[PDB]
Design an enzyme around this catalytic site. Structure first.
Site, PDB file in Angstrom:
ATOM      1  N   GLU A 139       0.804  -1.166  -0.075  1.00  0.00           N
ATOM      2  CA  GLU A 139      -0.154  -0.152  -0.110  1.00  0.00           C
ATOM      3  C   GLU A 139       0.817   1.353   0.145  1.00  0.00           C
ATOM      4  O   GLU A 139       0.602   2.093  -0.712  1.00  0.00           O
ATOM      5  CB  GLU A 139      -0.905   0.117   1.228  1.00  0.00           C
ATOM      6  CG  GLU A 139      -1.735  -1.313   1.509  1.00  0.00           C
ATOM      7  CD  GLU A 139      -2.880  -1.496   0.239  1.00  0.00           C
ATOM      8  OE1 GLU A 139      -3.010  -0.252  -0.367  1.00  0.00           O
ATOM      9  OE2 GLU A 139      -3.371  -2.469   0.418  1.00  0.00           O
ATOM     10  N   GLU A 197      -4.258   4.992  -1.146  1.00  0.00           N
ATOM     11  CA  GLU A 197      -3.424   4.233  -0.639  1.00  0.00           C
ATOM     12  C   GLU A 197      -2.553   4.500   0.661  1.00  0.00           C
ATOM     13  O   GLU A 197      -1.782   3.766   1.217  1.00  0.00           O
ATOM     14  CB  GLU A 197      -2.251   4.122  -1.828  1.00  0.00           C
ATOM     15  CG  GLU A 197      -2.717   3.649  -3.090  1.00  0.00           C
ATOM     16  CD  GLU A 197      -3.367   2.211  -3.396  1.00  0.00           C
ATOM     17  OE1 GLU A 197      -3.424   1.397  -2.346  1.00  0.00           O
ATOM     18  OE2 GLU A 197      -3.572   2.046  -4.466  1.00  0.00           O
ATOM     19  N   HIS A 239      -5.009   3.149   3.114  1.00  0.00           N
ATOM     20  CA  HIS A 239      -4.723   1.667   3.187  1.00  0.00           C
ATOM     21  C   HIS A 239      -3.615   1.354   4.065  1.00  0.00           C
ATOM     22  O   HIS A 239      -3.616   0.310   4.858  1.00  0.00           O
ATOM     23  CB  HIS A 239      -4.728   1.028   1.793  1.00  0.00           C
ATOM     24  CG  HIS A 239      -5.905   1.104   1.038  1.00  0.00           C
ATOM     25  ND1 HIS A 239      -5.729   0.928  -0.416  1.00  0.00           N
ATOM     26  CD2 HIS A 239      -7.167   1.315   1.240  1.00  0.00           C
ATOM     27  CE1 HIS A 239      -6.828   1.109  -1.099  1.00  0.00           C
ATOM     28  NE2 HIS A 239      -7.916   1.588  -0.096  1.00  0.00           N
ATOM     29  N   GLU A 263      -3.568  -4.577  -9.034  1.00  0.00           N
ATOM     30  CA  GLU A 263      -4.869  -4.399  -8.480  1.00  0.00           C
ATOM     31  C   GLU A 263      -5.970  -5.152  -9.081  1.00  0.00           C
ATOM     32  O   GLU A 263      -6.732  -5.927  -8.048  1.00  0.00           O
ATOM     33  CB  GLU A 263      -5.131  -2.702  -8.697  1.00  0.00           C
ATOM     34  CG  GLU A 263      -4.270  -2.073  -8.017  1.00  0.00           C
ATOM     35  CD  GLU A 263      -4.376  -0.236  -8.264  1.00  0.00           C
ATOM     36  OE1 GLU A 263      -4.628  -0.003  -9.274  1.00  0.00           O
ATOM     37  OE2 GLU A 263      -3.977   0.352  -7.243  1.00  0.00           O
ATOM     38  N   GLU A 294     -10.742  -0.133  -4.339  1.00  0.00           N
ATOM     39  CA  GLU A 294      -9.854  -0.621  -5.402  1.00  0.00           C
ATOM     40  C   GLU A 294     -10.533  -0.498  -6.800  1.00  0.00           C
ATOM     41  O   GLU A 294      -9.956  -0.652  -7.702  1.00  0.00           O
ATOM     42  CB  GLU A 294      -9.468  -2.203  -5.164  1.00  0.00           C
ATOM     43  CG  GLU A 294      -8.069  -2.503  -5.571  1.00  0.00           C
ATOM     44  CD  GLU A 294      -7.215  -1.815  -5.170  1.00  0.00           C
ATOM     45  OE1 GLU A 294      -6.956  -1.961  -3.825  1.00  0.00           O
ATOM     46  OE2 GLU A 294      -6.525  -1.047  -5.783  1.00  0.00           O
ATOM     47  N   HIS A 307      -9.296   2.192  -8.546  1.00  0.00           N
ATOM     48  CA  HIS A 307      -7.897   2.065  -8.924  1.00  0.00           C
ATOM     49  C   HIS A 307      -8.178   1.134 -10.287  1.00  0.00           C
ATOM     50  O   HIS A 307      -7.151   1.546 -11.262  1.00  0.00           O
ATOM     51  CB  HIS A 307      -7.134   1.523  -7.876  1.00  0.00           C
ATOM     52  CG  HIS A 307      -7.154   2.176  -6.656  1.00  0.00           C
ATOM     53  ND1 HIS A 307      -6.301   1.706  -5.542  1.00  0.00           N
ATOM     54  CD2 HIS A 307      -7.989   3.129  -6.352  1.00  0.00           C
ATOM     55  CE1 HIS A 307      -6.642   2.658  -4.640  1.00  0.00           C
ATOM     56  NE2 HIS A 307      -7.503   3.526  -5.057  1.00  0.00           N
TER      57      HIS A 307
HETATM   58 FE   LIG Z   1      -4.729   0.349  -5.213  1.00  0.00          FE
HETATM   59 FE   LIG Z   2      -4.265  -0.111  -1.767  1.00  0.00          FE
END
Ligand SMILES: [Fe+3]
Ligand SMILES: [Fe+3]
Ligand SMILES: [Cl-]
EC number: 1.14.13.25
Lengths: 136, 392, 515, 168, 130, 392, 74
Positions: free
Chosen positions: C103, C133, C136, C198, C232, C235
């Site tokens: 992360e 991130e 996370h 991801e 996610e 992402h």
């Molecule tokens: Fe990510």
């Molecule tokens: Fe992440």
């Protein structure tokens, strides 16, 4: 210490033994108590406060403190008074923690409770009736 | 019936909870429960902010402060390390020392901005219901606010993008968080300016909230010529991530941005009957002071007073300040030509008023930044340099 | 005018502002990325999840309040922190802290994508990813933070950001979802971090693992991880847009297939054996065979829904897939041999498979009992768990010719005399330095790009040093200063100390001295 | 043989004593250039301080950098390498050098040697970073042309390794 | 049934799985027309599973399979899956935008987007397909 | 070992969980899972606000709308019922019909005010750091804002206490919530005025944030004489809880309160360079529009258009409006004398500007309230009545 | 003045406002309770838990989020 236990005194008796004490002539009026009861609902912050404040420095200053595990909350009983400094708890927790934040999980009180600065206090004193024993 | 097994929860399934209880020791196997207890606390007690942030960056011992060892597992073609000392001219005994005084890890940061997000929409719904826009000076609304406050969004947007290489290159965790939160606040500023314009368009027939006129003004109007040149240099002309952070927030935005946002649009709103713009400038100014708190810690507490590289670092900071203060003075000199377009108000838009505004901006800056890195500055000289661009 | 206005209640919704974001950019000569890239194609794409800063903050704060309410109020009142099977509680020291650096590196990788993006909307979308991130990182930290406060063994949960540096498994983690993302082509991050990282691997690493957590009594990790992954989908969607830009341009699409294959092998090389080992050996109750998890998420669903669908547009099935599938079946058992043999270098307490575990391994991996099981049972006979035995299995490996090697590229350990997964040893000398490579894909990478792959391995740093000295120096002890964080059993008694390690007399060799 | 402790050992101590004796910019520049040529990259001359050279190089950088700020005018910090060369001329020279490279093997050695010679504090950080970026772009594109086209046996020959073992 | 978590080769165990897993035709990926949607269990999501996905959703897409994975809901279907936040808001009785829906939408295998109040994950390759 | 049993949790203890699992039926005993499904929804589907609020009050069928039966279990001495129809003159077929359009039960209400609470303190910490107080007009700050905005807190405070008997007497749950939430917003306004004064005190040496001067002005200055008279009557002169809410929010606060807060202090703050006050009035005006939406629903949608008692209720609302509008016109006539003390600004403080301000207030009030209950009003007449108090 | 001011970061804490709450009441003849009561004694007491509207909301919202997180999520 033992006299502040949740099951102290008559609460040890069962069956007819309890009934005879419960219905005894002398126990048909209330009896003045010098104790206070404090209930704290279990949470991350409260469980830290119980372990590192109430069960150490708190019981050191007031050895009559009893802390009992009641599943969802902590039951605390003590002679005279119980105090918790929100500043000490904030130091232990490492995050913002005013006296207003401490009350978030202060569930119940049996006695005279108040906040003064950063400190929460529950006391047997009858403020406004009891006369201060010192001019200091 | 589903094709896959319905997994029994160990917490609640009696058979699996019983198995788990038999395996769990009846005592703790260590009493050290403070997460990353070895972090050196900046304050009297270790903070949750520090516990969650500090040493997340896996720096080795050849990047000052790192606790790991050895070379990176994979580097750029040619040999550029994943993170490296080549990324900045500044030096320190420990890149981890920086601490945001607001102690912002991700959660308190979005928690606070969520409040501003929801309250903003409640305020706009009520402000429209109030009809308070009826008393705003129309020329200010249409000719100064919409066009030149809108053009200012491109300065905030460029400062936001200046952080992209900083987010990649910078050398510690708390620095990276400080940098990324600053970038979001800058793009927030740009989005909030456009939000105010879109909102006025809903209340004023014929009010155009298109970015066309603001963009033409930012890219071609001489009033923003010096400002755009500075932002373009800070954003795309350098990659030293300390130079970007310092020149961006501590010089350019601390002088030009503060004058434009606070001295011009916020202050003159309260001279021309604008009851709407102060709600928006309240956010950008709150963000500025929060950003200043962290920027000041990185460059003053940590780098300009690092026990081994303080004077070394002040040499570079003084050279940057010299360059970017000249750029900002030039930007401010261009900007004050806008006073020729506003209605004269004694003590506000006349020469005396503008002079006292520049005295605040340069005076505050000297106290907040110049004095703290040893940069000598004649405030009256900078005020008079800008006033050369003021049409009497 | 001054009297008449529409007083209907109105605000401004996020998509009303987002519509103007693309106009926030302006043209100047220097407005280009600062990072080296092979990809210079047109990339003026549109954001699939429109957000602005205020709406970003509102969404994530709403997620957080529920997550932290569950953690600090409900699960704490239940005492859920100490209802985890010890094997699994130990596994979360590794999974959460290792993922944390993935992360954390993803913050930097997403900033490169932010820097290399040309359209304002994509720059806006990648900033939101950068923010996620960070979120996370603190979520992963918070799990170990919470475990440190409420679980019966805080050691290792409470200091992994320094004690991870002792052991060999951490080296490979610094490449798989870290150096592999941030140290290379910026625009290519849309391929390795996003299209592979991801869209493929976060699903078993972050979603699927929550069912193993639940099975073993851990409701802390699902609470957090399942919130992590909600971010996610932006992402993946971010990366997909850029991959469409690359595919639509013939000049840039000529690089895509090679970059896809290197990304896939780079990540599967470590993820496949390490996560399979953590799932199957770091649990009591098993959800399903790891190879079936791999088959479902990696080969069939990601391979089919992303790579198979993109095959219509010239994207090829990764050439390394066959080798990968062989790793999915055996590599984590190979890894378990290395992990159990070198347990004093970790920061978790391990458990040899019990009789029920062994029957499960053999039923689902026929041949396991005769190869891996007999070794584990012999180590147990020799006193693997007993601090008075003076037995550490790494010495036993060497005494029987079962040398351990470190791949110069991926850092993954390799035991060629015992491995059943993909690999064969290649030892080259170059400019006076010996290097050990273990597969055709990593060997090509090292042969072509030797300056990218200079990572010191544990044997090079620790050579000739005694085991207990390395551990003590790296702070691999509990608060008493003597008891090891790492253990060869999960019981609360008979824990090993530095002196117990010292009695074994384990000294690090040079595995390549024989060549 | 037997490595010393990771973070504090006699090799690092001894090298810090050599570094402390540098007194001028010219002297520390030749020191750091010779060191990086001797001890860094796959074409280094010696692996004798392999587990320490990165820390040692950090300490040389720190010495050169303080000596720069103490001894040099500010304009030199921005526009010149510590070799005395014009920083912008260094950039143009080495970019054109790698664009003239005929193979990935020529290009890689050009990029590696540029970093050995001009890694900060020798070249100013801003000029170094954009030069290193331009070079990496060229090196990446030529290395990723027909990336799988040469068999491993052929790559081993082109690289010049001594093959010490190949598992059957 | 072809969208079940344990469909196809996942029914096999032991040597029978290994023979399928290592079969020659299965050493390259195979294009799938499916999408996978993961929803973490919450009060809001569970009401959506019972009263939207498993009713009107499965009636519109009979290939939908929903599986219980302890902490989350696992959903796989042919072509596309859509969830309307405006429908969910009427079901829950509290304000509920498409942004609020995503609070518990954990994972996606497929091309995902929001358009108005609707959330969609689709097999279509936007920007490549017509 | 504690004296009392450590209770086993049925959710996690294997033996108790297994016992509970055996007793729980393998199927639901009913399919109706909508809490209080029988509530008539006001909107497309039942809202959580209605589910949690509606029919909490246990009224019997002899109080219109009640689902219960029989007399109260215990009544006042004399026989006054716990709740009764004698509490108000207005009549309806169902006292439960009211719906707050913001759908505020307790949680969204404190959630929103918490956002404003925390953001206010971040804004102040930043405003003081900005030094923006430096450009406020000192005469406005010291002689008008501190004293007369200070005095205005007593109007807000009196309006807050007017709700005390409403909170006891009103006849349904959604109405009680509306009243109480409106009361806290009013005392919030008073407390927020004092917060701003206490804040300026920290910034301006000699600035006195004591309430002595504001209280003297509120109680004895002719400028607030009519306002104080009205507030005292609405608060302590009546007990009809509908009259209190109508006169308080829909007449007095909608006319006098809106002129003082919005047309005087907020508007003129943006004329005299006051960048602080708009942040505080932004909250009071937001609160006013939220309260209005709820007050509008009670008296217009429910009461003025009740199928059986609409005209009946309009008779009382018109009599109340006649009385309290006259009270507010007198309050406004007294109040505009304050313009004699402010510096003249063309179009804001001259006769023309005050006239247009009164036209907005009376014009908006006619549309928002008078027109909806059939109350005839000449706006120009009410403007001229107040302008009689303006010193030209 | 126009240039010089203390720019130390300050706010206003709830007890700083609460200090002035008692002064918010003013005297008038009708300022008495509306309800029948036997108790007509002096009652100028002070609050033990100082709170203002903004702080009241913050405290209770904080309680709520933890409660509703536990219920709706965990
Ligand atoms: Fe990510
Ligand atoms: Fe992440
Ligand atoms: Cl089928």
């Amino acid at each position: 210490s033992a006299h502040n236990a949740y099951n102290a005194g008559i609460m040890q008796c069962t069956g007819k033994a309890f009934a005879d004490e419960f219905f005894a002539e002398e126990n048909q009026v209330v009896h003045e108590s010098n104790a206070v009861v404090l209930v704290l609902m279990k949470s991350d912050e409260i469980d830290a406060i119980i372990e590192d404040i109430v069960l150490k420095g708190g019981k050191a200053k007031n050895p009559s403190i009893v802390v009992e595990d009641k599943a969802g909350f902590w039951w605390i009983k003590a002679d005279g008074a119980i105090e918790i400094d929100a500043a000490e708890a904030g130091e232990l927790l490492g995050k913002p923690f005013s006296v207003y934040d401490l009350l978030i999980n202060v569930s119940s009180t049996v006695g005279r409770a108040y906040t003064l600065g950063t400190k929460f206090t529950i006391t047997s004193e009858l403020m406004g009736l009891d006369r201060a024993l010192t001019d200091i | 019936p589903q094709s896959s097994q319905v997994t029994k929860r160990g917490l609640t399934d009696p058979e699996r909870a019983a198995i788990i209880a038999a395996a769990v020791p009846d005592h703790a196997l260590d009493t050290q429960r403070k997460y990353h207890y070895f972090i050196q606390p900046r304050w009297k007690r270790l903070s949750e902010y520090e516990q969650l942030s500090c040493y997340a960056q896996p720096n080795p011992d050849w990047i000052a402060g790192g606790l790991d060892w050895g070379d990176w597992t994979q580097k750029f073609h040619g040999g550029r390390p994943s993170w490296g000392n080549e990324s900045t001219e500044l030096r320190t005994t420990d890149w981890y020392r920086h601490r945001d005084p607001a102690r912002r890890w991700h959660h308190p940061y979005v928690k606070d901005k969520s409040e501003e997000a929801r309250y903003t929409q409640r305020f706009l719904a009520a402000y429209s219901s109030e009809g308070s826009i009826r008393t705003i000076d129309p020329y200010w609304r249409d000719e100064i606010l919409n066009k030149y406050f809108g053009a200012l969004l491109y300065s905030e947007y460029g400062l936001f993008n200046a952080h992209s290489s900083v987010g990649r290159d910078c050398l510690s965790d708390t620095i990276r968080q400080t940098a990324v939160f600053a970038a979001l606040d800058k793009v927030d500023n740009a989005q909030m300016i456009q939000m105010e314009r879109l909102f006025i368009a809903k209340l004023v027939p014929g009010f155009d909230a298109s970015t066309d006129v603001p963009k033409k003004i930012w890219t071609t109007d001489p009033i923003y010529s010096g400002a755009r040149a500075t932002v373009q240099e800070i954003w795309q002309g350098v990659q030293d991530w300390n130079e970007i952070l310092w020149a961006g927030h501590a010089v350019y935005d601390a002088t030009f941005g503060q004058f434009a946002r606070r001295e011009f649009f916020q202050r003159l709103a309260t001279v021309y009957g604008d009851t709407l713009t102060p709600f928006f400038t309240a956010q950008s100014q709150t963000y500025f002071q929060t950003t200043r708190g962290a920027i000041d810690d990185l460059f003053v507490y940590c780098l300009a007073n690092d026990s081994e590289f303080g004077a070394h670092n002040r040499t570079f900071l003084n050279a940057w300040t010299e360059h970017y203060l000249a750029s900002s003075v030039a930007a401010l000199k261009d900007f004050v030509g806008l006073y020729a377009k506003v209605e004269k108000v004694a003590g506000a838009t006349d020469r005396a008023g503008v002079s006292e505004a520049l005295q605040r901006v340069f005076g505050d800056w000297k106290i907040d930044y110049a004095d703290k890195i040893g940069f000598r500055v004649d405030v009256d000289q900078k005020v008079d340099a800008v006033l050369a661009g003021y049409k009497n | 005018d001054a009297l008449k206005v529409n007083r209907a209640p109105v605000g401004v919704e996020p998509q009303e502002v987002h519509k103007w974001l693309q106009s926030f950019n302006w043209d100047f000569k220097e407005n280009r990325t600062k990072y080296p890239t092979k990809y210079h194609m047109a990339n003026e794409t549109k954001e699939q999840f429109k957000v602005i800063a205020k709406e970003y903050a509102r969404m994530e704060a709403a997620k957080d309040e529920r997550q932290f309410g569950t953690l600090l109020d409900g699960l704490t009142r239940l005492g859920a922190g100490n209802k985890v099977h010890p094997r699994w509680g130990e596994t979360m020291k590794v999974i959460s802290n290792f993922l944390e650096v993935g992360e954390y590196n993803a913050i930097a990788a997403s900033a490169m994508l932010w820097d290399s993006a040309t359209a304002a909307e994509q720059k806006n979308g990648y900033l939101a990813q950068v923010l996620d991130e960070i979120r996370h990182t603190h979520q992963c930290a918070f799990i170990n933070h919470y475990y440190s406060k409420h679980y019966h063994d805080p050691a290792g949960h409470n200091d992994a950001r320094r004690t991870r540096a002792i052991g060999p498994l951490w080296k490979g983690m610094k490449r798989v979802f870290a150096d592999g993302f941030i140290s290379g082509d910026a625009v290519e991050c849309s391929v390795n971090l996003q299209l592979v990282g991801e869209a493929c691997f976060t699903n078993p690493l972050i979603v699927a693992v929550t069912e193993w957590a639940s099975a073993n009594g851990d409701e802390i990790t699902p609470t957090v991880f399942l919130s992590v992954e909600t971010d996610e989908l932006r992402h993946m969607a971010n990366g997909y847009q850029t991959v469409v830009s690359i595919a639509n341009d013939p000049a840039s699409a000529k690089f895509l297939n090679t970059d896809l294959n290197n990304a896939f092998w780079t990540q599967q090389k470590y993820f496949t054996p390490v996560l399979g080992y953590l799932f199957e050996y770091g649990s009591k109750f098993k959800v399903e065979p790891w190879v079936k998890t791999w088959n479902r998420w990696v080969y069939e669903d990601w391979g089919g829904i992303w790579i198979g669908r993109l095959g219509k547009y010239g994207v090829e099935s990764p050439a390394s897939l066959r080798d990968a599938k062989r790793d999915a079946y055996w590599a984590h058992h190979d890894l378990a041999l290395a992990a159990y043999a070198m347990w004093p270098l970790g920061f978790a307490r391990l458990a040899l498979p019990d009789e029920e575990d062994q029957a499960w391994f053999e039923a689902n991996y026929p041949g396991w009992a005769d190869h891996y099981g007999k070794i584990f049972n012999e180590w147990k006979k020799l006193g693997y768990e007993d601090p008075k035995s003076g037995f550490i299995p790494y010495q036993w490996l060497l005494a029987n010719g079962h040398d351990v090697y470190i791949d110069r590229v991926s850092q993954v350990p390799f035991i060629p005399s015992l491995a059943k997964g993909t690999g064969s040893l290649r030892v080259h000398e170059f400019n006076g330095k010996k290097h050990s490579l273990t597969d055709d894909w990593g060997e090509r990478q090292w042969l072509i790009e030797p300056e990218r792959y200079e990572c010191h391995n544990v044997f090079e740093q620790y050579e000739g040093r005694e085991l207990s000295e390395v551990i003590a120096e790296g702070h691999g002890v509990r608060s008493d200063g003597k008891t090891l964080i790492a253990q060869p059993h999960t019981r609360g008694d008979n824990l090993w100390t530095l002196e117990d390690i010292k009695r074994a007399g384990c000294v690090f060799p040079d595995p390549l001295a024989k060549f | 043989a037997k490595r010393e402790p990771i973070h504090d050992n006699s090799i690092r101590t001894e090298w810090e004593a050599k570094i402390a004796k540098l007194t001028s910019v010219d002297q520390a520049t030749k020191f750091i250039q010779d060191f990086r040529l001797a001890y860094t990259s796959p074409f280094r001359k010696s692996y004798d301080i392999d587990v320490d050279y990165q820390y040692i190089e950090r300490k040389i950088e720190e010495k050169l950098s303080v000596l720069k700020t103490e001894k040099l005018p500010v304009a030199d910090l921005i526009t010149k390498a510590t070799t005395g060369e014009d920083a912008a001329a260094v950039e143009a020279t080495w970019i054109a050098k790698i664009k003239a490279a005929k193979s990935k093997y020529e290009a890689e050695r050009i990029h590696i040697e540029f970093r050995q010679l001009y890694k900060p504090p020798v070249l100013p950080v801003n000029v170094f970073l954009r030069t290193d970026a331009a070079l990496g772009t060229v090196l990446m594109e030529i290395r990723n042309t027909d990336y799988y086209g040469t068999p491993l046996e052929g790559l081993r020959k082109e690289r010049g390794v001594k093959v010490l073992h190949l598992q059957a």
